[PDB]
Each structure stands twice: as structure tokens, then as C-alpha cells.
Amino acid sequence: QNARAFEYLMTRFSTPEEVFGPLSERLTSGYLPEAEIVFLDEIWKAGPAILNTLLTAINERQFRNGAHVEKIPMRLLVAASNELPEADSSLEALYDRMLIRLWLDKVQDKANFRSMLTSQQDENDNPVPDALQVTDEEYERWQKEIGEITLPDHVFELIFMLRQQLDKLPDAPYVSDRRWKKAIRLLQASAFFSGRSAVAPVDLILLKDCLWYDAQSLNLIQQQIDVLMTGHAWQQQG
Amino acid sequence: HPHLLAERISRLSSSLEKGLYERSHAIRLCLLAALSGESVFLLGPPGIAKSLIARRLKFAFQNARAFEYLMTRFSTPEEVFGPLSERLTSGYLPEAEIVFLDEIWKAGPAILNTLLTAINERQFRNGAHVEKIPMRLLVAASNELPEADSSLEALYDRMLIRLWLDKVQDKANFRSMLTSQQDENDNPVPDALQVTDEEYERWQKEIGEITLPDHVFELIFMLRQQLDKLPDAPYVSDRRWKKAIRLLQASAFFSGRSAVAPVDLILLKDCLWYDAQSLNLIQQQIDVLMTGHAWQQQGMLTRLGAIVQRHLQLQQQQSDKTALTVIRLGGIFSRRQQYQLPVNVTASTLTLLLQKPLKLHDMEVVHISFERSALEQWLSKGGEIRGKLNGIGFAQKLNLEVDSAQHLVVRDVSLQGSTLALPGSLPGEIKQQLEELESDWRKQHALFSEQQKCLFIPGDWLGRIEASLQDVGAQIRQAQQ
Ligand SMILES: Nc1ncnc2c1ncn2[C@@H]1O[C@H](COP(=O)(O)OP(=O)(O)O)[C@@H](O)[C@H]1O
């Protein structure tokens, strides 16, 4: 009911004044410090000062607005690109902090391409009804009830086992401790909006887009989880 | 008054630990360096809680500011110390207290040049006049190591504490860590445990007033000469030895002490090494020093040997009263058997006395000491005996055989006879000198049983110190039996 958009393209010669609003103390009228859902395309080529300001707006939800600081009501942070960053660069600090790594691709099915090729639905209207939109009061209350989800003993036996399996495989990517803590908030939120009070074992499917980092480790993460979900989840291989 | 200071620090570090498991060695080391004006370095993979410790120690004070910046390959000094108009340093580093600099091994050339003047002088140039920086804690984290021939080594050699963090390994400490409800942006430190600005300026002057005992200097100078003789040991500059004293004097200040304690030398395990190769060498030399010359472990070993030498000297003169005799079992059996003293020696290493001394291994000997759990091997399997001499050295090969009268005749290079015997089952001269050395062990043990409550000491080091003190005490109680 109170969301704003911000579609910006990061270039090799971009300046922080053209992103967070130019100063006069900074004219942040509809940009990022007061926005909710911002879009950043081609993030792997911005300036050095642009990436440094984005790290403080994630762990603290604040911004250095000259003298006094202020909070940022950022609810969703999305970023898209095409290529991959270097192996020894400063751009890996933001990639290791992002949770979900969606892997989109072009369409392949023929039945779903007929209506998609000739679609009359507008992409700038409001297809969401006014009765299905949440208010600002319900958002602040839901941020606290997610952490109250209990962790069953059977769920912990699969998280610790998957961590030890990737450590023994040399070709498996390294997963930091921050990724394991942030992934629980995603699984607990999935069972919260599904009519459950505890962490469901089926929620481990979403971990296929939170462990890999390149195209080489994409076929390894989706393979170990497929065996885990069809082996030790509901005691398949057991 | 000094005794109540150690209790206030123990309650301050307890609230800082809430939220970060298996990180007690990293928070306690940053708290002591912040109250003494020292730096700290962290190394490890990105994602092992390296930036939160810089934002957590600021809540333990009353006027602290945070500064989390990431140094890049194209970073400029104007974006770190504030742009100029004379420089707008509103909330950056010249007026901050605890700053955080991640990936410091890739900044610009002018960035590192300004960080060197803000450490030795605590100042920063600003066009014309200069000003002081109220910096209290300097932390820097990264991932890899710099080059061997580069300009980045000027800052690494100046940092004192080199923390070695790593990912979690324990399973019990990972359950509550995986699902933690503690916020990382609140104020878990109470208002009563936060020091003021007046108490900080007063503590910085009382650290230098800590006296240096004469026994403590014997351990620092010995460690410096030991690392110089080892080619694989890392080089330690003279600046590191001077800056390490401020860390040890600050540990005893917040622990209820007025002098430098020998137990404070444990913190030197993270202030000498520089890479992963020298990490296992520094922790090995200190472990031997703390269990050898700290509380006079080996110092009493060279003194107890002189008492045993004087005691065995008066016992070998009257060894003609009772000698050694091995049985000659036969009846219905082949070769006879050979053994040693029974319950008369209740130890794994028994001693033997000889009458006529000989020259074995181009040296004189007054008593032959064998192993109780190893002498039966040669006496049953046969071959060549392996025993030490004078209670020292390795198991040398001697020329021992069986005599017609069952006597351990130790032969040499001249085919000379030497019948071994046993000491008698305590003179007044030996007992008087033994009580003087035994009383010294109780004085050294009483010091460890009073200062072990230091919060800035890891728990795994107390197991090796207690095992080293009981080993010396178990040997001094053998001669008095
Ligand atoms: N070993 C750990 N134990 C507990 N919490 C951790 C650990 N590692 C990371 N975290 C949590 O992850 C969050 C972000 O950590 P971060 O600053 O990214 O670490 P780093 O600076 O090492 O990358 C912190 O709030 C911290 O609570």
C-alpha cells in the first residue's frame, strides 16, 4: 500500500550523487533512502563509493545522510546482471551477503509460449486487488513472529549433514556462517505463510539457489540437494 | 579497589559474548586492546563474524562512533577521511573512536600513507594545522596475505594482535547459533558497565606505571634468543617487543594485580607469527616455555638432580651390604629368566647403583637408571639392551651380560667387571636440602592458584600448566620415600 520503484542501471562511470540524490542535506526525493523496492541492473561495474554505501544499508538499514543518519524502509532488494565478477575483486563482498540467487532462463515449453507470444495484459496497470494488499502495521508485526518459529531436532540433522558433505568435496563451493543463519529466516518465513508453526523438512528445496556462486557449482548444489531430498529427507535412503 | 576492577570487566565481556558463539578469544582480545590504545588484526574467510565485533565494542563505551568501510582497488583518500571544501570530517575517522577497514590489502598508495601517521602520533593533517584523533580501537579484516616484497608490510609489522578466526566446528554450539533471536543492532550492554571519558584518560597513564619483576625479564629475553637461532622462526622486530609490554601490563591491570604476571605471556601466541607456516611454531615454543621456565618447572629439575646426585653418592659408598641377585628357575624348562627389583621401586624408571665405576660412552657414570616397563624386554626377548646413563640422555646401548653368580656385570671396552646393586631403604643433610626445594614448589604453585581467574587467558592453556606442575611435584616426592 506504500511502495516505490527505482529502476537504475549501474555504469562504469556512475556517481553516487546520481543514485542517492544530489546534495544541496541530500535531495533524496524518490530514490533509495525513502524507497522500498529498488532495482539495480549491471551491479558488477559501479564505482567504488557506490558499493561501499550499499553495505551499510543492509546490515543496519541506515544511510550516512551528511550529519545525522536516518533509517531506510527497504523491504526488497533485487539485482540482476549477465556476467560474473572476478575471483579476486571487491565485488564479492556484496555477492556473499545476498541470500537468494535466482537462475532464470528463456522459455522452453511450446504450450506456455502461445499465449506468451500474443499477450494483451498490460505491464503498468494494477492487477492486484485492494483487499489482498497488506498494510504498514501488518508488516512490522510479521517481522517479529518469523524468529519465533521453533527448530525441530529432525531438521537440524539435515542442515549439519549438508554442511559437512560440502566441506569434504573439493569441487563443492565454500559456504560462510552468515549464509546458514540467513537461510533459516527464509525457511521459517515459508512455513509461516503456509499454515505451520515449525520448520518443515520440505522447505529445504529453496536451498538450491543459496549455495552456488557460478555456473560450475550450479550443477553440484542442485545434485547434492536432490539426493538429500530423495535420500535423507523423509528417510528415503534411510 | 583494584580487586573490584576485575569483577566489572568480567561482567562487561559477558554481555558482548551474547550473540557470537565460539568467539570468546576474539572479543576479549579486542576489549583489552581498546582500553590500552592498541590495534588488532583478523584473518579468515568472509563470513565468520569479522565486522560485527567492530560494531559491538562501541556499545561498551558512552561516546563511541562506528565506521565500516571497504577498501577497494580504486579507492580515494577523499572518500575515507571526508571530502574537502578544511576537510569535512563529519563522522568518519579523525573524530571517530572504533573504525573498521575490510580488505585493507588493496587500497590506494595515499591511503596507507595517512594511516601510518595516525598510529604513532594519533594525529592527522588537515591543510595547515593538525588535530588529534580520539581513536581507541583499530581493527582490520581480510582474507588473503600480502606479497613478500611490497609496501603493505609496513602496516602489518606495526599491528600487535593477530587473531586467527575460523568457521564453526562444534555441533552443540551450532544449534543455538543457527537459530539465534538476538539482534545485532541493539544495546545489550547495561548503562552501569559503560565507562566514561574521564576513566579512560586515567587508565591510559596507570598502565605504564606497572613494575617489571626481574623473573619476568628472564622469560622475554630467553624467547628472543631462542627464535633467533631457529632459521624457520619468524623475525620479530624491536617495536613488537616494546608494544607487547603494554598488552601484558594491561592484562594484569584489569585482573587485580600491580605487577607483570608470568601467566600473561600466553597472549604472545598471536603477536609474533605472520603466516600459516609460522602459526604452529610460535604456539610450540611458548607452550614449552610456559611449561618449562614460567613457574620454574625446569629450574627445579636442574636443582633436584644435584640433590639426588649428592644422595646417591653416599649410598654407593656403602653398596657392599646388599647387592642384586636374580633367580635361576629351571626344573622343567629351557633358558632361565632374568628380572629386576620388585616392589622396592614404585616407579616406571628405577635406579641402580654400582661399586667400581667405569667409563661408558667415553664418560664417567655413578648410577645407572633403567625403565621398569622396558627392561623386561631385553631380559626376555634378548638382543641388545637400551638404557640411559645418569638419568639423562636417550636409551644408549650398553654391554651387559649374565654372570655365573647371577650379577648384572656391566662390561665396557676393557672387559671390566661391575656388579650392580640397590640403594638402601634418608640422611639429615639430604633431607635439609630437599625441604628447601620442596618449599619452593609450594610457593610457585600458590602463585598459580590465585591469578588463574584472569579473563584474558584461554581455558585450554590451564590444562597444560597444571599437568606440568604436578609432574615436577611427583618426582620430588620420590627421593623422600
Ligand atoms: N561464527 C559466527 N557465530 C555467530 N554469528 C555469526 C558468525 N559468523 C557470522 N555471524 C553473524 O553474521 C552476521 C554478519 O556477519 P559479517 O559482518 O558478514 O561477518 P564478516 O564480517 O566476517 O563477513 C553478524 O551479525 C553475525 O551475528
Side-chain angles (χ1 to χ4, degrees), chain A residues 2-6 19-20 31-40 43 53-63 70-79 94 97-99 136 139-140 143 182 185:
Chain A
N2 192 0
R4 293 179 181 177
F6 181 75
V19 177
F20 294 98
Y31 289 100
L32 195 145
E34 69 179 2
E36 291 85 4
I37 296 95
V38 296
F39 181 74
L40 297 176
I43 203 67
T53 58
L54 293 174
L55 294 174
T56 62
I58 296 170
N59 291 318
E60 293 179 353
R61 293 288 191 269
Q62 293 179 356
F63 182 75
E70 65 183 1
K71 60 100 176 179
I72 298 171
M74 182 179 72
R75 294 179 181 177
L76 183 62
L77 182 63
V78 65
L94 184 64
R97 294 183 185 273
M98 292 185 285
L99 182 63
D136 291 331
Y139 181 75
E140 294 293 328
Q143 293 294 321
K182 291 175 71 175
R185 190 175 179 87

Side-chain angles (χ1 to χ4, degrees), chain A residues 48-49 51-52 59-60 88 90 93 147-148 151 153 156-157 159-160 163 167 174 176-178 180 184, chain B residues 23 45-47 51 55 68-74 79 106 167-168 171 174-175 177-179 181 185:
Chain A
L51 195 271
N52 293 319
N59 291 318
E60 293 179 353
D88 291 330
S90 296
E148 292 180 353
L151 197 273
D153 291 330
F156 185 75
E157 294 293 327
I159 298 169
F160 182 75
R163 184 177 182 270
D167 187 74
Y174 180 75
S176 66
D177 291 331
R178 183 178 63 246
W180 293 103
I184 303 299
Chain B
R23 295 292 185 269
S51 66
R55 295 179 293 173
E68 183 178 1
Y69 187 78
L70 179 63
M71 290 294 173
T72 63
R73 292 180 180 177
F74 293 99
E79 293 178 353
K106 63 180 73 174
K167 64 183 181 293
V168 296
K171 187 177 180 180
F174 188 73
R175 179 67 181 271
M177 179 266 173
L178 187 64
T179 60
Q181 293 180 357
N185 290 319

Side-chain angles (χ1 to χ4, degrees), chain B residues 49-270:
Chain B
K50 295 183 290 294
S51 66
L52 185 63
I53 51 95
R55 295 179 293 173
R56 184 65 61 84
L57 268 297
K58 68 180 182 180
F59 291 101
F61 291 162
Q62 293 180 357
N63 192 0
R65 293 179 181 177
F67 181 74
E68 183 178 1
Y69 187 78
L70 179 63
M71 290 294 173
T72 63
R73 292 180 180 177
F74 293 99
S75 296
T76 61
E78 294 293 328
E79 293 178 353
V80 177
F81 295 99
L84 79 159
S85 66
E86 65 183 1
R87 294 177 65 88
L88 294 175
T89 63
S90 178
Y92 289 100
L93 196 145
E95 69 179 2
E97 291 85 4
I98 295 95
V99 297
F100 181 74
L101 298 176
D102 194 1
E103 295 293 327
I104 202 67
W105 308 108
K106 63 180 73 174
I111 298 169
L112 196 271
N113 293 318
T114 59
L115 293 174
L116 294 174
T117 62
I119 296 170
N120 291 318
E121 292 179 353
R122 294 288 191 270
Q123 293 179 356
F124 183 72
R125 63 179 64 88
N126 193 0
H129 296 285
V130 298
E131 65 183 1
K132 61 100 176 179
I133 298 171
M135 182 179 72
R136 294 180 181 177
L137 183 62
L138 183 63
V139 66
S142 178
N143 193 1
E144 66 182 1
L145 293 174
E147 294 292 327
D149 291 330
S150 179
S151 296
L152 270 300
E153 292 180 353
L155 184 63
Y156 189 74
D157 290 330
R158 293 183 185 273
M159 291 185 285
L160 182 63
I161 301 168
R162 275 82 171 274
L163 292 177
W164 180 258
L165 275 74
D166 197 358
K167 64 183 181 293
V168 296
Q169 293 295 110
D170 187 74
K171 187 177 180 180
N173 290 318
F174 188 73
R175 179 67 181 271
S176 296
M177 179 266 173
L178 187 64
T179 60
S180 178
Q181 293 180 357
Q182 182 62 255
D183 190 359
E184 68 271 15
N185 290 319
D186 290 332
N187 204 165
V189 176
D191 291 331
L193 294 174
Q194 294 178 356
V195 299
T196 62
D197 291 331
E198 184 178 1
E199 293 179 353
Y200 181 75
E201 294 293 328
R202 188 178 65 246
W203 290 351
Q204 293 293 321
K205 190 256 182 65
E206 293 180 353
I207 293 169
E209 292 180 353
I210 299 299
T211 62
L212 197 273
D214 291 330
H215 189 273
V216 179
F217 183 75
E218 294 293 327
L219 293 174
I220 299 169
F221 182 75
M222 185 177 177
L223 185 63
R224 184 177 182 270
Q225 296 294 321
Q226 184 62 255
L227 295 174
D228 187 74
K229 291 177 70 68
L230 294 174
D232 291 331
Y235 180 75
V236 180
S237 66
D238 291 331
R239 183 179 63 246
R240 184 60 53 83
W241 293 103
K242 185 176 180 180
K243 291 176 71 175
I245 302 300
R246 190 175 179 87
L247 184 64
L248 271 72
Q249 288 179 354
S251 179
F253 179 75
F254 294 101
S255 296
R257 291 187 295 272
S258 66
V260 177
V263 74
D264 291 331
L265 276 76
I266 302 169
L267 294 174
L268 294 174
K269 68 181 178 67
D270 291 331

